[PDB]
Amino acid sequence: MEEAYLALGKKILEEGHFKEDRTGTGTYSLFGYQMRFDLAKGFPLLTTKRVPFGLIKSELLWFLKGDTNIRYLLERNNHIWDEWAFERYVKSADYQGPDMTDFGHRVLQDPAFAEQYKEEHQKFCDAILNDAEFAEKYGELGNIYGAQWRHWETKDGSFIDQLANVIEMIKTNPDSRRLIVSAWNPEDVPSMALPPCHTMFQFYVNEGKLSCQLYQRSADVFLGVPFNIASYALLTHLIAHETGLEVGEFVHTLGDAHLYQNHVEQMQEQLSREVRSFPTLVLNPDKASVFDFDMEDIKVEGYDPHPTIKAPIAV
Amino acid sequence: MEEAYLALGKKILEEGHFKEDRTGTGTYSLFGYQMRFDLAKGFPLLTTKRVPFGLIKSELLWFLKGDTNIRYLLERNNHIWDEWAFERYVKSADYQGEEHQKFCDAILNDAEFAEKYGELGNIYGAQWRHWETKDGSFIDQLANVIEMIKTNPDSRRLIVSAWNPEDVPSMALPPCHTMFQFYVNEGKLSCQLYQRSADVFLGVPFNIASYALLTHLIAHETGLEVGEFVHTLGDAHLYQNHVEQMQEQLSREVRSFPTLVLNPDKASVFDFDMEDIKVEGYDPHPTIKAPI
Numbered sequence: 001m002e003e004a005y006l007a008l009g010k011k012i013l014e015e016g017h018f019k020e021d022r023t024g025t026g027t028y029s030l031f032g033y034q035m036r037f038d039l040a041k042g043f044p045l046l047t048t049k050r051v052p053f054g055l056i057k058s059e060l061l062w063f064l065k066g067d068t069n070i071r072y073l074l075e076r077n078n079h080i081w082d083e084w085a086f087e088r089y090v091k092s093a094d095y096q097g098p099d100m101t102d103f104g105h106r107v108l109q110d111p112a113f114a115e116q117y118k119e120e121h122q123k124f125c126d127a128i129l130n131d132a133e134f135a136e137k138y139g140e141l142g143n144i145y146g147a148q149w150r151h152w153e154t155k156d157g158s159f160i161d162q163l164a165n166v167i168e169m170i171k172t173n174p175d176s177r178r179l180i181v182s183a184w185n186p187e188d189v190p191s192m193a194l195p196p197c198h199t200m201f202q203f204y205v206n207e208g209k210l211s212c213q214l215y216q217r218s219a220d221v222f223l224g225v226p227f228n229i230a231s232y233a234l235l236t237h238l239i240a241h242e243t244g245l246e247v248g249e250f251v252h253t254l255g256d257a258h259l260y261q262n263h264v265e266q267m268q269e270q271l272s273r274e275v276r277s278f279p280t281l282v283l284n285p286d287k288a289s290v291f292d293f294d295m296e297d298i299k300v301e302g303y304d305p306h307p308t309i310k311a312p313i314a315v
Numbered sequence: 316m317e318e319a320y321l322a323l324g325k326k327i328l329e330e331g332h333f334k335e336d337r338t339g340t341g342t343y344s345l346f347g348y349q350m351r352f353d354l355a356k357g358f359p360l361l362t363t364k365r366v367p368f369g370l371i372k373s374e375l376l377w378f379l380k381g382d383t384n385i386r387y388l389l390e391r392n393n394h395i396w397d398e399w400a401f402e403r404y405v406k407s408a409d410y411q412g413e414e415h416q417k418f419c420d421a422i423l424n425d426a427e428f429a430e431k432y433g434e435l436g437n438i439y440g441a442q443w444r445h446w447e448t449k450d451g452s453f454i455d456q457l458a459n460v461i462e463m464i465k466t467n468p469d470s471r472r473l474i475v476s477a478w479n480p481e482d483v484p485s486m487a488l489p490p491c492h493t494m495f496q497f498y499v500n501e502g503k504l505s506c507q508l509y510q511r512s513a514d515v516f517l518g519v520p521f522n523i524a525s526y527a528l529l530t531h532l533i534a535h536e537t538g539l540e541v542g543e544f545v546h547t548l549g550d551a552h553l554y555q556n557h558v559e560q561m562q563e564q565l566s567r568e569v570r571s572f573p574t575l576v577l578n579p580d581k582a583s584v585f586d587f588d589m590e591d592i593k594v595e596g597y598d599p600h601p602t603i604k605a606p607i
């Protein structure tokens with residue numbers, strides 16, 4: 001239930017110890033947590049703040065087609081992965097704009113700089129969208145989720161389609177204790193723009209219901225987890241659709257669960273709001289495979305959230 | 316707390332799902348579970364039944380040094396990895412139809428025979444310390460994670476994976492312990508294990524002591540105190556013929572966990588052997604026997 005998510009935020013506010021982090025933002029953090037969502041009780045898109053489903057859909061579909069270039073996202077007005085690509089670009093020999101070192105913090109502190117970053121970021125998005133040589137070089141994030149799900153590269157010149165294999169094993173071997181997809185590929189991790197935050201997931205089938213457990217090594221509680229929960233709930237629904245199953249539970253297991261220190265007022269504001277009913281997922285009945293779904297084939301209905309709560313992403 | 320392990324056994328008895336596999340083996344299972352052991356409260360070797368710690372520690376030591384040859388285990392009277400070696404040998408060319416002992420002696424008293432017949436393949440030692448890459452080099456995940464703990468303790472990337480989808484469909488025993496993660500705060504090291512598949516009566520008690528000991532060994536190597544071992548399960552199943560054993564165990568009063576003692580006069584755990592790891596004040600209820 002949404003309550004389980006809100007209790008996590010509250011526990012971190014109360015007892016999450018301060019921890020320096022890679023991003024230089026600083027976090028309050030706990031280690032080891034588990035939340036369960038019964039998918040039969042509604043689609044888990046949070047109601048205590050508006051969570052944009054279109055972004056969640058486009059990101060999942062991008063994962064599912066095995067794509068690790070941000071061009072596909074930009075064409076669907078999804079900018080959630082922009083900063084890491086832009087970061088690679090501004091560190092490259094080809095960038096010749098104003099200095100962008102530490103842009104992630106500097107935009108919050110210095111408005112003249114915020115305006116330069118907005119200008120450079122606009123030119124970057126334009127070039128990815130319109131210049132295919134530029135897209136190919138600078139849209140690339142390395143072998144992140146899409147690549148490992150669809151195209152885990154083997155030692156003898158091939159690739160494993162892990163996710164398609166797990167879907168097929170659910171159909172013919174539902175009681176398998178190995179229905180696993182891992183994005184943690186030790187060889188590719190160093191050249192990934194980020195190692196996988198949502199790291200490994202496992203399926204389970206009982207009395208015609210499909211459940212999914214995600215192990216998430218690193219969880220951005222305010223900004224990222226709402227996306228992650230909906231993303232894996234959507235995936236479980238797509239797979240249940242293809243395999244002719246009903247949906248069971250999504251179980252979300254966390255390693256370093258953290259609230260960024262500049263998300264604290266936002267989380268507090270969120271905790272002051274009454275929970276509403278989760279919406280309902282609607283999927284196009286005519287699509288057979290998970291890999292056949294496009295944007296128009298997936299919607300959420302009866303979604304009536306409290307207003308958007310804005311917060312800065314830690315780069 | 317031991318109470319957390321007992322609560323899992325009780326919940327499985329009360330509401331686990333029954334399944335019968337292709338050969339008649341019944342289980343009661345649930346999916347997605349998490350237990351926490353605060354290692355400052357004592358070392359989680361179960362008190363409601365005797366769990367033999369010798370075998371746990373020679374096994375764990377064997378993984379830690381990345382050894383995949385069973386000679387190290389036999390020297391220490393650990394026989395749990397013997398079948399997928401003796402089975403191999405009797406199907407080889409040089410065999411002629413107790414014979415197990417002749418095999419065990421040769422592994423021990425003949426070097427070449429050990430390399431030829433004592434070598435297991437792709438198991439924990441190899442995955443943790445010697446993960447093969449495309450160009451034929453190797454990543455030592457565990458040694459890397461240790462250095463990261465010393466130099467970058469705030470890291471959210473302290474991960475060791477045992478899961479390669481290239482290798483899994485091919486292996487006799489794909490790893491039950493799929494990955495684990497360390498965490499450091501306030502001078503204390505914690506560890507979370509993700510376990511895809513858990514034999515609740517027979518395996519989980521061994522698994523808990525094994526990862527608790529690992530956390531202690533890494534803490535020792537890194538100059539840290541111990542925090543918690545967090546045990547996350549995927550498919551947690553109680554075999555149908557372990558039900559009476561689980562019920563007997565649940566009838567027994569919990570006692571205080573013992574205290575783990577490591578040789579202080581020895582700096583690196585890569586030089587640890589059996590005598591460097593001790594358990595004090597272990598006072599458990601009797602062994603509960605069960606079909607494997």
Ligand SMILES: Nc1nc2c(c(=O)[nH]1)N(C=O)[C@@H](CNc1ccc(C(=O)N[C@@H](CCC(=O)O)C(=O)O)cc1)CN2
Pocket residue numbers: 051052055079080081194197198220223224225227228309310311312313314315
């Ligand atoms: N700091 C951080 N970096 C990360 C992640 C994360 O969760 N946190 N993600 C780990 O998965 C990936 C990116 N996922 C993201 C998900 C949401 C937003 C975000 O800013 N959402 C806002 C605004 C949405 C909009 O309208 O564009 C929001 O929800 O209000 C950013 C990145 C990779 N890097």
